[PDB]
């Protein structure tokens, strides 16, 4: 799947390439800006916007990118300036786009990307002195806006969830025409596009540790692979079975696992359509 | 899952830390006050209050702590540990529910603020009279819920899942209401006390291990309490009560006169 | 500009001089009483009272006094000076606002008159019980006003004028209401406490000078508080809050991608 993170919001990757690489603030400057203004809505049990759904996933994706980044530094700073060049640059553009579309409006940021493009394409002998400005003058749960918890997702066994290869094959076989659509179509589609993109960022970083500096691939499939297996399984199943069905299946299969085998139905529950 | 024993009753642990540890009457003095005033209601087939429910589980939890304490003294250094750690938290819980039954709940919350003002005062300006509250037993744990100990006595010991598996089912399904400042049911009140009763029972057992026969005497009793209140929240009370009737007919029937599959609780 | 900390709350300094200096509970005893009773309201995005506002600035001022006191002990003679002079005035301010939240404001003013009658009595006719009040934590200073510490963290250290220049702007524009016996706004209440907090901070610094790193740790924090409340009185709160948004976009933009002039707060 070639999924654009900006396509459902009316932008593309090449449209945000109009701003230079050093236009964007640091991740600390942007994560402080989100918590200064949207910390009560980014931790709300509501969707509230597609921009809030896409911002919650990018905040959790950077934490998993930085969990792997410090772990390689303990178990081999050459790893961390590669993250700031490749993965952290994509995080900074994605954080900047959603924070400023919340602050200023999505049409305003799309008008501004065009206006800054005309300004930066001007040669410096004819460029105006003032650039265009956009001025109008935190622990997140990935499942909370969908009615679940990390506690309810871990209520099921660790080895219950299918492989990350089988889930990306399922999303490609069933939702490739909608995950690559320029529409939102659901909050499940928004949270699933970011999960597919974030797994590509970690799989880019994990093979870079493997080629340059192979114990890291076992670690990412234990901690970050299990978290992406539950995240892919949750949103795929809520698309094909419904969100209320998957929430009741989590407490049906969970109590069935806890029940002694002599006093439960003999076969495991399953979701079927 | 961190449960406050007083959050549904308008207080906190930090509000009852205003009173000192030696303020509270002994367990024997508090159980006599309960027996003399509230015995036909604490042995009643009614709920009668959320205070009556929380007091019933607290009297029954002290009996399991004393049964565990009198055993490990046969197999007095431990009784100085029970009275300092587990007997003190029972004494705060027994005092709180007797006093909110005798004086009302808003009187005890107001008395907690007033005793805090008295205890924070330096002694040159603190009056000699401390504030006082003046202006106004065999318990079955299941009897207020329609069941009995004898009705649940037919379920074998391997029917129930682990205490860990029952504390995960409570936390994955009901944590939002077990840590709520509401009551929400008498099944939630009884479930809050049983989780804290297991926490007092476990810290005694890990301390005397520095032995796990508690998993056939006290852990079995906790497992039926944890099973009964989880199931009555999941399936409903009348569904669980009529399942316990039909399971008992099955388990009293000898083999070759019953179907080889036990009844299943669902739907 | 001489500000009475209790004039908007119906009292004076001379009325709280009826109580002796050793009457008041310790700072640790008073902060636990605030934490146990008023923490979801003292960490709330609401005002909820003028007493809640004055209590928030007093808890945050004691933290800056203790940060200044624990530094100069590394570079215990000063802690006997803080507890005698600055810790005593905090203890009167912490006691007054906790007690007017717990018992009401008219009860505390009546208790101050009654304790004065008791303390003036000669000891042969003074009763043994002193009068008592019986009948009924990480704070953000800007959170009740719509801002945060992180929102004001983008303004550089040279944005703000001097503490002297900010105390003259308050005195030349708002002295008639900062010395009034009214509240007039939550911005006036917070401004009264910050001017008195700087006075307690400065007398400690001139005493330990008989060193001015307070102008990059504590004077910087006072300068943002003095700037924010003066500007929200001058320009309005929503004008200042949307200026802080637009200034942050400007200061996060690197040079050669922003206009070379910062946004100006006016109109």
Author numbering:
A (entry chain B): 1 to 76, 195 to 255, 285 to 360, 372 to 431
B (entry chain A), C (entry chain A): 1 to 75, 195 to 255, 285 to 358, 375 to 431
Question: What did the published study say regarding this structure?
Answer:
We have developed a modified HBV core (HBcAg) VLP, termed VelcroVax, with surface expression of a SUMO-Affimer. The genetic fusion of these monomers using a sequence encoding a Gly-Ser linker ensures that the genetically fused pairs will dimerize within the assembled VLP, termed tandem HBcAg (tHBcAg). The genetic fusion of two monomers results in a tandem HBcAg construct and the introduction of an anti-SUMO Affimer into the first MIR of this tandem construct forms the basis of our VLP capture system, VelcroVax. In common with the wild-type HBcAg protein, the modified VelcroVax protein assembles as both T = 3 or T = 4 particles, composed of 90 or 120 core protein dimers, respectively.
Freshly purified VLPs were used for cryoEM data collection, and structures were determined for both T = 4 (at 2.9-Å resolution) and T = 3* (at 3.6-Å resolution) configurations. As such, this configuration was termed T = 3* rather than T = 3, and 5-fold (C5) symmetry was imposed during image processing rather than icosahedral symmetry (I1), which was imposed for the T = 4 VLP. The T = 3* reconstruction was less well resolved than the T = 4 reconstruction, likely because 5-fold symmetry was imposed during refinement to account for the unique symmetrical arrangement of T = 3* particles. Both the T = 3* and T = 4 reconstructions had clearly resolved density for residues corresponding to the helices of both HBcAg molecules within the tandem VelcroVax sequence. Unsurprisingly, given the presence of flexible linking sequences, the SUMO-Affimer, the second MIR, and the internal Gly-Ser-linker lacked clearly defined density. The fact that each fused dimer could occupy one of two orientations, leading to four unique arrangements per asymmetric unit for the T = 4 particle, also likely contributed to the poorly defined density of these regions. Although the majority of the VLP was well resolved, density for the SUMO-Affimer was not evident in reconstructions of either T = 4 or T = 3* VelcroVax VLPs. For both T = 4 and T = 3* VLPs, maps low-pass filtered to 10 Å revealed additional density above the four-helix bundles consistent with the expected size of the Affimer, confirming that Affimers were likely present but were not resolved to high resolution. In an attempt to resolve Affimer density, data for the T = 4 configuration of VelcroVax was subjected to symmetry expansion and focused 3D classification, using a mask to isolate the region above the four-helix bundle. However, while there was considerable variation between classes, none of the classes contained well-resolved Affimer density, confirming the high level of variability in Affimer positioning. Focused classification yielded no improvement in Affimer density, and particles were distributed relatively evenly between focused classes, suggesting a high level of variability and flexibility in this region, as expected.
